[PDB]
Motif scaffolding. Structure first.
Motif, PDB file in Angstrom:
ATOM      1  N   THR A 146       0.764  -1.259   0.000  1.00  0.00           N
ATOM      2  CA  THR A 146       0.000   0.000   0.000  1.00  0.00           C
ATOM      3  C   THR A 146       0.778   1.281   0.000  1.00  0.00           C
ATOM      4  OG1 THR A 146      -0.230  -0.111   2.390  1.00  0.00           O
ATOM      5  CG2 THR A 146      -2.037  -1.000   1.057  1.00  0.00           C
ATOM      6  N   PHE A 147       0.143   2.344  -0.475  1.00  0.00           N
ATOM      7  CA  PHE A 147       0.721   3.675  -0.543  1.00  0.00           C
ATOM      8  C   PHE A 147      -0.305   4.696  -0.006  1.00  0.00           C
ATOM      9  CE2 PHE A 147       2.714   1.106  -3.837  1.00  0.00           C
ATOM     10  CZ  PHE A 147       4.057   1.308  -3.543  1.00  0.00           C
ATOM     11  N   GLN A 148       0.139   5.753   0.658  1.00  0.00           N
ATOM     12  CA  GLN A 148      -0.803   6.729   1.169  1.00  0.00           C
ATOM     13  C   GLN A 148      -0.574   8.106   0.594  1.00  0.00           C
ATOM     14  OE1 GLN A 148      -1.497   6.478   5.698  1.00  0.00           O
ATOM     15  NE2 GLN A 148       0.135   4.972   5.470  1.00  0.00           N
ATOM     16  N   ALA A 149      -1.657   8.855   0.442  1.00  0.00           N
ATOM     17  CA  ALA A 149      -1.548  10.209  -0.067  1.00  0.00           C
ATOM     18  C   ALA A 149      -2.562  11.063   0.647  1.00  0.00           C
ATOM     19  CB  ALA A 149      -1.767  10.243  -1.527  1.00  0.00           C
ATOM     20  N   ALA A 150      -2.345  12.359   0.700  1.00  0.00           N
ATOM     21  CA  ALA A 150      -3.255  13.250   1.407  1.00  0.00           C
ATOM     22  C   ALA A 150      -3.519  14.488   0.564  1.00  0.00           C
ATOM     23  CB  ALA A 150      -2.608  13.659   2.737  1.00  0.00           C
ATOM     24  N   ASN A 151      -3.022  14.463  -0.673  1.00  0.00           N
ATOM     25  CA  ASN A 151      -3.107  15.581  -1.618  1.00  0.00           C
ATOM     26  C   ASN A 151      -3.306  14.920  -2.914  1.00  0.00           C
ATOM     27  OD1 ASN A 151      -2.405  18.409  -0.971  1.00  0.00           O
ATOM     28  ND2 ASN A 151      -0.595  17.446  -0.030  1.00  0.00           N
ATOM     29  N   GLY A 152      -3.705  15.724  -3.887  1.00  0.00           N
ATOM     30  CA  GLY A 152      -3.920  15.213  -5.219  1.00  0.00           C
ATOM     31  C   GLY A 152      -2.571  15.140  -5.872  1.00  0.00           C
ATOM     32  N   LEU A 153      -1.737  16.135  -5.553  1.00  0.00           N
ATOM     33  CA  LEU A 153      -0.361  16.259  -6.052  1.00  0.00           C
ATOM     34  C   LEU A 153       0.513  15.069  -5.591  1.00  0.00           C
ATOM     35  N   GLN A 154       0.486  14.731  -4.301  1.00  0.00           N
ATOM     36  CA  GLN A 154       1.222  13.580  -3.804  1.00  0.00           C
ATOM     37  C   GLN A 154       0.709  12.285  -4.450  1.00  0.00           C
ATOM     38  OE1 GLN A 154       1.940  15.158   0.839  1.00  0.00           O
ATOM     39  NE2 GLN A 154       0.901  13.203   0.412  1.00  0.00           N
ATOM     40  N   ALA A 155      -0.587  12.232  -4.765  1.00  0.00           N
ATOM     41  CA  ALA A 155      -1.224  11.065  -5.407  1.00  0.00           C
ATOM     42  C   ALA A 155      -0.771  10.871  -6.854  1.00  0.00           C
ATOM     43  CB  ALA A 155      -2.724  11.217  -5.392  1.00  0.00           C
ATOM     44  N   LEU A 156      -0.820  11.945  -7.629  1.00  0.00           N
ATOM     45  CA  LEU A 156      -0.386  11.934  -9.005  1.00  0.00           C
ATOM     46  C   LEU A 156       1.061  11.449  -9.082  1.00  0.00           C
ATOM     47  CD1 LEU A 156      -2.862  12.789 -10.180  1.00  0.00           C
ATOM     48  CD2 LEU A 156      -2.152  15.179  -9.815  1.00  0.00           C
ATOM     49  N   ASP A 157       1.850  11.842  -8.105  1.00  0.00           N
ATOM     50  CA  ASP A 157       3.251  11.486  -8.045  1.00  0.00           C
ATOM     51  C   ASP A 157       3.467   9.983  -7.865  1.00  0.00           C
ATOM     52  OD1 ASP A 157       5.728  13.131  -8.104  1.00  0.00           O
ATOM     53  OD2 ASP A 157       6.178  11.938  -6.287  1.00  0.00           O
ATOM     54  N   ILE A 158       2.706   9.403  -6.947  1.00  0.00           N
ATOM     55  CA  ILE A 158       2.793   7.984  -6.662  1.00  0.00           C
ATOM     56  C   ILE A 158       2.211   7.166  -7.833  1.00  0.00           C
ATOM     57  CG2 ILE A 158       1.947   6.157  -5.161  1.00  0.00           C
ATOM     58  CD1 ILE A 158       2.049   8.204  -2.841  1.00  0.00           C
ATOM     59  N   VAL A 159       1.288   7.737  -8.594  1.00  0.00           N
ATOM     60  CA  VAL A 159       0.738   7.000  -9.727  1.00  0.00           C
ATOM     61  C   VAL A 159       1.873   6.870 -10.747  1.00  0.00           C
ATOM     62  CG1 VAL A 159      -0.959   7.040 -11.642  1.00  0.00           C
ATOM     63  CG2 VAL A 159      -1.648   7.628  -9.289  1.00  0.00           C
ATOM     64  N   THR A 160       2.495   7.998 -11.050  1.00  0.00           N
ATOM     65  CA  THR A 160       3.591   8.070 -12.002  1.00  0.00           C
ATOM     66  C   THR A 160       4.827   7.233 -11.623  1.00  0.00           C
ATOM     67  OG1 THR A 160       2.835  10.329 -12.593  1.00  0.00           O
ATOM     68  CG2 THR A 160       5.067   9.683 -13.309  1.00  0.00           C
ATOM     69  N   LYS A 161       5.084   7.064 -10.329  1.00  0.00           N
ATOM     70  CA  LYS A 161       6.279   6.316  -9.911  1.00  0.00           C
ATOM     71  C   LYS A 161       6.054   4.890  -9.578  1.00  0.00           C
ATOM     72  N   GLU A 162       4.890   4.635  -9.007  1.00  0.00           N
ATOM     73  CA  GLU A 162       4.586   3.307  -8.585  1.00  0.00           C
ATOM     74  C   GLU A 162       3.652   2.492  -9.424  1.00  0.00           C
ATOM     75  OE1 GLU A 162       6.310   1.931  -6.168  1.00  0.00           O
ATOM     76  OE2 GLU A 162       7.414   3.848  -6.373  1.00  0.00           O
ATOM     77  N   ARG A 163       2.925   3.135 -10.340  1.00  0.00           N
ATOM     78  CA  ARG A 163       1.939   2.447 -11.177  1.00  0.00           C
ATOM     79  C   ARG A 163       1.093   1.473 -10.338  1.00  0.00           C
ATOM     80  NH1 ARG A 163       4.219   0.095 -16.761  1.00  0.00           N
ATOM     81  NH2 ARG A 163       1.966  -0.099 -17.118  1.00  0.00           N
ATOM     82  N   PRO A 164       0.285   2.016  -9.406  1.00  0.00           N
ATOM     83  CA  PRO A 164      -0.536   1.141  -8.573  1.00  0.00           C
ATOM     84  C   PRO A 164      -1.722   0.561  -9.348  1.00  0.00           C
ATOM     85  CG  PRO A 164      -1.202   3.342  -8.161  1.00  0.00           C
ATOM     86  CD  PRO A 164      -0.076   3.429  -9.190  1.00  0.00           C
TER      87      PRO A 164
END
Length: 119
Positions: free
Chosen positions: A28-46
């Motif tokens: 799992t990965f956690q985010a609290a912003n849309g910006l932090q979320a977009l970042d994890i999508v791009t790096k982690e491909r969840p």
């Protein structure tokens, strides 16, 4: 393993969702912003994204359009208020697997991720 991104500003719910899916066997990965979320999508491909439409700064409908552009196959499950019918429709238009209204039944979320994202 199979990855789940949790984008939620409600700390307790985020920490609870996190502990459940981690117990299940998902990474799992956690985010609290849309910006932090977009970042994890791009790096982690969840695999699956659990997105609270009520996140700080960016509107959920926009962070959803953006995730789609990064990964046209991103599988999102939006969380919203029961009276946001037109917004629920839009997400549906955009590609949301489904949606859960808050407050929800953690057992119901737990059952849906296993139905859409079989581990």
């Amino acid at each position: 393993n199979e990855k789940i991104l949790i984008v939620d500003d409600q700390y307790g719910i985020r920490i609870l969702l996190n502990e459940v899916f981690n117990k299940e066997g998902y990474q799992t990965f956690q985010a609290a912003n849309g910006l932090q979320a977009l970042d994890i999508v791009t790096k982690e491909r969840p695999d699956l994204v659990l997105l609270d439409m009520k996140i700080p700064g960016m509107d959920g409908i926009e962070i959803l359009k953006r995730m789609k552009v990064i990964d046209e196959n991103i599988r999102v499950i939006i969380m919203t208020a029961y009276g946001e019918l037109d917004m629920i429709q839009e997400s549906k238009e955009l590609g949301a697997l489904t949606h859960f209204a808050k407050p929800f039944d953690i057992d119901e979320i737990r059952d849906a991720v296993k139905k859409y994202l079989p581990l």
